[PDB]
Write a protein that binds this ligand. Sequence first.
Ligand SMILES: N[C@@H]1[C@@H](O)[C@H](O)[C@@H](CO)O[C@H]1O
Length: 857
Amino acid sequence: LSVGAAAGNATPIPGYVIQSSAQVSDDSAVSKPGFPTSGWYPVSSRSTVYAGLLQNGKYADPFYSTNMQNVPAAQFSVPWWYRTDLNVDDTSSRTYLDFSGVLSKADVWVNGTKVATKDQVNGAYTRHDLDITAQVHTGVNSVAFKVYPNDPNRDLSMGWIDWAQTPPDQNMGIVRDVLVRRSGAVALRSAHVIQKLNSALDHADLTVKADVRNDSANAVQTTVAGTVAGKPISQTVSLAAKERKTVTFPLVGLDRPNVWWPAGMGGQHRYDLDLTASVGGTPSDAAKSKFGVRDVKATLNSSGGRQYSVNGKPLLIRGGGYTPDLFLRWNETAAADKLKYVLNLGLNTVRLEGHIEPDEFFDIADDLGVLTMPGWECCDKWEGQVNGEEKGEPWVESDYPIAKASMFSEAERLRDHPSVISFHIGSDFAPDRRIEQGYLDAMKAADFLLPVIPAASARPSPITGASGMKMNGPYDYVPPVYWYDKSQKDRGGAWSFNSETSAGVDIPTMDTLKRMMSASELDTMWKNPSAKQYHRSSSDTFGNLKLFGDALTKRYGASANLNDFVRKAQLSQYENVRAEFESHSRNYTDSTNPSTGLIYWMLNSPWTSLHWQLFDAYMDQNGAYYGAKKANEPLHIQYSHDNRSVVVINQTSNAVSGLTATTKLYNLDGTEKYSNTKTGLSVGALGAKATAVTVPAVSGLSTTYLAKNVLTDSSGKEVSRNVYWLSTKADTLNWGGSDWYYTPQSAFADLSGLNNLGQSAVGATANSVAGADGTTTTTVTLKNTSGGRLPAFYVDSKVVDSAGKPVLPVEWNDNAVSLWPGETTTLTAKYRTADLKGSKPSVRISGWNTGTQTVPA
Ligand SMILES: N[C@@H]1[C@@H](O)[C@H](O)[C@@H](CO)O[C@H]1O
C-alpha cells in the first residue's frame, strides 16, 4: 500500500492481514514496521473476521446445510487484529485515518503508538477522523486495529434478530473502508448541499456548506472554492491554529433543475459538488460529491396513516425489507444486481431495518431511482432502553454519546442521497425523550432534513409523535383473503402503512434447494414440515415450517414427493405474495383508512433461506418472486379475493384511457363458465384504480377453477394478463385464535383439483443477441400447441447453460405465464454475457401441466 502526498488524496486500505489477539502478547508490537505476521490471514477490505476466514479456506460454505454450526465460536470472544503496512514517500502532507464500520469497537495503533482506544472508536456507525501526522514517517509505516468482539445486545452495532442464524463471529471486524487521507495545513470535511425546490419544481435554491479545520501550528487564511451544479463558488475565512469552522456559501439559484424522480416518474439525475480548500495559493484538501434536487414529505393522513410524497406526488410505498449478506461480504456489482431486481419486481422502495449499507449502495439506489427507508433496528442494543424484556441491554451513560454520534455520522452520510425518503429513529419501540432528543439534535447538526419516523410499529415517540405505521404481523402463513381485511384493527390487512409483513415460508427453486440442503434435509422438509430447519430461523417461533406445511396440504393436497411439495410451494407463494401486494394497491385510494404502504418481509435473505424472501441468496426467482412481479405491473389487472371485483391499477405517471378488461372463468376441463368484457375504462396515474366488474356467483364451477383476467389497451395490445386458481370453498379466518405473528384458519380453500388438471403442451422457440453493452438478451416464443381445450398453466422459463444450470442474475419482462390453446407469448430475458461463462445459452421450460423441455437459445 503506497499513498501519494497530493492534497485531497483519500485512499482506501485494500486489505489487511488478520489474527486473533490470542497470538499477540504485546499489543504495541503489532503496528511496528517489521512485525512478523507468519500464519496471519490475508483478507480484503470490508471483511468481518469470519468472512476473512472463509476467504482463506478455513471453514466450509455456511450456505450449505449445518456447516456454520461446525465453527467454534469461542475464538471470537477475544479481540482480533487487522494489520497493514503503509508506504509514505513524503511526509510534507498531514495524514489521517478516516473510517467507520468497526464492530464493535477498536484500539487503533500506528508505528507502536496507540492513537485511539476502544472507548473512543466504538459503535459500528461512528465515524473517526484520526490525525496520525505525529506518528507517520517516510518509508514503511504500519497501522493496526485491535477489534473487539461484537455482541449486538450490548453494543450499538448490527445484529440479526430472527432473520437467519447467528454468524459465529457476530460480524466482528471492519465492514467499511478505512481511508488514508492526505492534506496540508487545512482539512476539508462534511461538504454538502442543502437544496430547496419550489412547488412548481422549476427552481431550486442551493446552500453549500463545508467545514475547514486548521490542523497546523499557525493561523491561516483558507479559500474554499469550486463548483456546485455547474456554477462557481468561493469563500475565504480565517482559522486560528486548531480551529474548525463551518463555511456557508451565499445562496445559489438553479433554474429548470434536472429534478430527480423515483424510477418510472422521470430521470435520476444527480448534480456534482467539487471543492478545494487552498492555503497560500496552493490546494490543501479537496472533496467531490453528489446531490439530488428532489422534495420528499411524509405526513399523517386524516386516517392517521403515514403518507409519502416525492416532488409533491403522493405514492403508495411498494417495497421489501432489504438485508445485506449474513457475514457483511461487500460486492458493488451484487448490490447493483439486488437493487435492479427491485425494479424488475416493479417495486419502488426498500427498507433497511438497521444493517445500513456502505455509500455505494445509496449511490446505486440514487442512480436506479429506488427509494430507501433506512433506520435503526429492533430487538437488540438500539432499543435496549425502551424495549423491556426484549433482547438488548438498558443504556448506561457512555451509550448516549455513541448513539448520538452514530446518528450524526449516518445523517452526514445519507443527507445528499435523493433515494433516501426518511430515517426511522425507532423500529419496534419508539425512543424515549432523552434518546429522541439526541437523534433530533444530531440530525439538525448534520442538516439532515428528511422525514423522521419514530417507529415502524404504531408506537409514538414523545417529540415527533405518532408513527402513522403498524406492525401487527403476520410473519407466517395466512390465506390470500386475509390481506383484504379491514375489520381487525390489531391485524395486518391492507390499511395504514404495513412496515414489515409476509406469509412466512418462501421455498426457493429446486436449483437453489440442492445447493443449500442435503438430500436428507430436503426429505425431512416435505415429509415433516414440523421438523426444525437450520435454514429458516434461530427463533423458536419460526424454527420449522409447520403452519406452511399444514396449509399446503389442506389447500393444495398432500405432497406425494419432494417435487410435488416444491411445485405446490411455488403456487402457494405466488398466490399469497400476489394477494398481499394487490390488496394494498387496491385499498390505497380508499376514502377511509387507505393502505399507504407495504414492506414485504423480506425482499431478500442474508443467506440461503426457506423464508421471508422474494429472490434467494443466489438471485434465483421462484413463485414468490413472480407473484410479487405480477402484482406490481405498471398497468395491471387483478381479482379481489374478498368480494370478487376485477380491478385495474395504473402505477404509471400518466392517466390511461380506452382500456378493456376481459374476465373469463374456466373449469379445469377447459369449459368457459363466465365471460365479461368491460370496454372504455379510464384510470388515473400513480396508483389509482377502476373497477371493471364484480364476478357473480357462477353455477356449475369445478371445486378448483380458473379466472383468466386480461387487460388490453386502446390499440388492442395485451398489457396485463393475470390467471388465478380459485376454489368454490372459501378460506376463512379464526380471528379469535390470532397470535402476534399469524391468524389460524377455520376453513381452507380447496385448490387440490390442480393435481388432476390434464396435460397441455408448449410450444417453444429461442434466440439470443450478445450486445455491445456486455449484456445478452434471450427472446423466447412460447405457444400452447395442444389439440384440446386445456391451458398450459404456470409455464416457467429459465435461462440455463449447457449443463442446465440457471444463469443468474437474470431479468425477464414476464414469466410464469399461462396460455390458452393456440395462444403465443414472446418473453425477453437479459443478463451479463459473462455470466454464461463461455456456454451457449439454452432455455429450460417447465409448466405445471406441460412437463419440462430445454431448447437452444
Ligand atoms: N422488527 C422486527 C423484525 O426484524 C422481525 O423479523 C419480525 C418478526 O419477528 O418482528 C419485528 O419485531
